[PDB]
Amino acid sequence: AAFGRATHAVVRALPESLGQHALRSAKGEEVDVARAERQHQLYVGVLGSKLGLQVVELPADESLPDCVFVEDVAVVCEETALITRPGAPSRRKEVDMMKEALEKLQLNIVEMKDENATLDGGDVLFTGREFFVGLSKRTNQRGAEILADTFKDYAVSTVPVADGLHLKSFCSMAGPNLIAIGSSESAQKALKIMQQMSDHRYDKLTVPDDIAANCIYLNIPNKGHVLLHRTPEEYPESAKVYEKLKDHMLIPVSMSELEKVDGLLTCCSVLINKK
Numbered sequence: 001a002a003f004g005r006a007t008h009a010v011v012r013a014l015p016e017s018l019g020q021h022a023l024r025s026a027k028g029e030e031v032d033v034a035r036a037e038r039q040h041q042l043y044v045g046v047l048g049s050k051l052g053l054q055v056v057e058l059p060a061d062e063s064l065p066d067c068v069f070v071e072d073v074a075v076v077c078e079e080t081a082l083i084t085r086p087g088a089p090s091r092r093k094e095v096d097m098m099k100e101a102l103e104k105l106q107l108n109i110v111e112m113k114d115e116n117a118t119l120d121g122g123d124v125l126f127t128g129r130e131f132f133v134g135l136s137k138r139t140n141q142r143g144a145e146i147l148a149d150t151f152k153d154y155a156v157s158t159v160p161v162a163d164g165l166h167l168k169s170f171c172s173m174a175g176p177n178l179i180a181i182g183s184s185e186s187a188q189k190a191l192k193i194m195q196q197m198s199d200h201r202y203d204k205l206t207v208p209d210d211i212a213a214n215c216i217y218l219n220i221p222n223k224g225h226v227l228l229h230r231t232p233e234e235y236p237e238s239a240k241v242y243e244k245l246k247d248h249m250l251i252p253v254s255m256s257e258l259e260k261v262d263g264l265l266t267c268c269s270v271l272i273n274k275k
């Protein structure tokens with residue numbers, strides 16, 4: 001009932017400098033920055049226009065090429081916001097605008113300040129009853145410690161993440177007590193770690209493409225149990241798996257341009273529930 005409720009979405013415009021200077025783990029086609037802006041506008045359109053969330057759009061900062069990926073700089077649970085200390089040096093000033101937006105939303109703000117701590121919000125899976133935090137190139141144990149202290153109400157457990165991935169590079173919540181999970185060995189080992197550490201186990205939805213396991217679940221009262229998932233023209237066989245959720249309002253949303261710079265669906269928004 002309560003899980004996935006949101007009233008506000010914080011997003012951030014992307015900068016033109018993204019196409020050229022955004023951190024990129026794997027190299028391939030270049031980014032069509034104009035097209036990426038169109039896909040990002042369609043995505044904000046789903047959140048605000050279609051689903052009715054109050055969207056706070058932060059302006060783009062050319063000096064922060066990754067500023068569109070707001071998920072990495074803030075983790076919000078109930079009324080408290082953890083402003084993170086991103087692993088990547090170039091991203092650290094992205095917290096300034098985030099701090100200001102969340103102040104305006106009157107959230108309890110905690111700023112990660114231990115200079116031995118790093119945490120990327122994309123490494124944080126909040127399941128509704130606990131947190132899993134990936135230990136990765138961007139998030140270390142000290143960062144997980146600070147998250148645990150900030151959200152003392154919830155258990156926090158760490159999961160090793162290999163190869164410059166983030167935890168949510170291959171998983172996300174697809175519904176109450178339901179983890180969407182990739183089929184790779186790494187994704188499957190991560191899940192069994194999470195399952196063994198939890199108080200009690202989660203249901204799972206296995207999708208063939210790891211990247212397609214990153215989706216956005218929203219409880220919009222009197223609209224539906226909404227899932228934004230990658231399109232059938234991006235990942236056809238994963239999209240078909242999501243179709244089995246006959247009780248969900250399924251919304252295909254493309255992220256094909258920003259995926260080139262490791263940008264998935266959860267990365268582009270911070271969802272908040274204001275009562």
Ligand SMILES: COCCN[C@@H](N)NCCCCN
Binds near residue numbers: 023024120166168169
């Ligand atoms: C859900 O996370 C998937 C991986 N990317 C997230 N973490 N940040 C976006 C990439 C920023 C660097 N260009």
